[PDB]
Ligand binder design. Structure first.
Ligand SMILES: OC[C@@]1(O)OC[C@@H](O)[C@@H](O)[C@@H]1O
Lengths: 159, 159
């Protein structure tokens, strides 16, 4: 057994659709070049953007930006409030998202990140970026960018 | 497809060390409390410790400490020089280690971490800690702790 070196342990596969998560924003907005590339779409074309935040005992720990290319999902995703985003989508539409690719990196918090995660400038973040496809195939339905306070959470994975 | 946030990408599920990794040390040594817990052995009993490092043009990128419980691997492991340590072990003994658990954290380098990875105080590191098993058994075979400069490497995983 490996002991935990951070206060909280989070399963990597569960982290993007956590059940204590709260929606902070749900808007239609033009796709940045980086969002457009992940989704396989055109820069500046509208995407659904939801931002969610989870706290533990008040303390913001994980902020996630979720981008979907399928605007048919808008009347559904705008009604998400709190809880597991993917569970919400699945009950509403029967669409079950599964992960295709994950990227994990660490960087110093800059700018709007410090503000939204409520942390001092340059505090380390773990950044987990995932492409999810419908239980089906290989056109990503969701690109999510999660930023977690590295001083509070360690990710775990069982194989 | 996702852009890369770092100069180099390493597969999170790749076992052992990079094909250009060099051995820094192979020794028998008493297990520390963390190492003994991971390997499910008594603190203080000997383990084989190998340390490897990947550099690019002299710049240290990825340091891994690998700790094996089976001392009978010593004739093999003391002979490792460079390359993929898991490929070397497999070529020499037939043992192909498989992962049971992974923990990923991030932290700011200090003291001996800054010395070994040749980086400034507080430089962000990704720390990846894994337990690996010979096909089947309760006893893990190997506990490894990777420390990688987060300004130079991002991890990827295909699902
Ligand atoms: O970042 C906000 C804060 O409340 O988070 C928990 C602790 O790290 C406190 O130092 C810190 O001010």
């Amino acid at each position: 057994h490996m002991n935990a070196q951070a206060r909280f342990s989070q399963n990597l596969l569960d982290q993007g659709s956590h059940p204590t998560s709260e929606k902070l924003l749900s808007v239609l907005r033009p796709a940045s070049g980086h969002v457009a590339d992940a989704l396989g779409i055109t820069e500046g074309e509208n995407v659904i953007h939801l931002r969610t935040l989870r706290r533990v005992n008040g303390v913001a720990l994980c902020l996630i930006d979720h981008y979907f290319a399928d605007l048919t999902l808008w009347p559904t995703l705008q009604r998400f409030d709190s809880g597991s985003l993917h569970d919400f989508l699945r009950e509403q539409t029967g669409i079950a998202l599964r992960r295709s690719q994950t990227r994990i990196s660490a960087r110093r918090a800059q700018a709007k990140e410090c503000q939204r995660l409520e942390i001092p400038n340059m505090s380390p973040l773990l950044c987990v970026r995932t492409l999810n496809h419908r239980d089906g195939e290989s056109s990503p339905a969701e690109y999510s960018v999660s930023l977690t306070r590295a001083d509070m959470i360690e990710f775990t994975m069982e194989h």
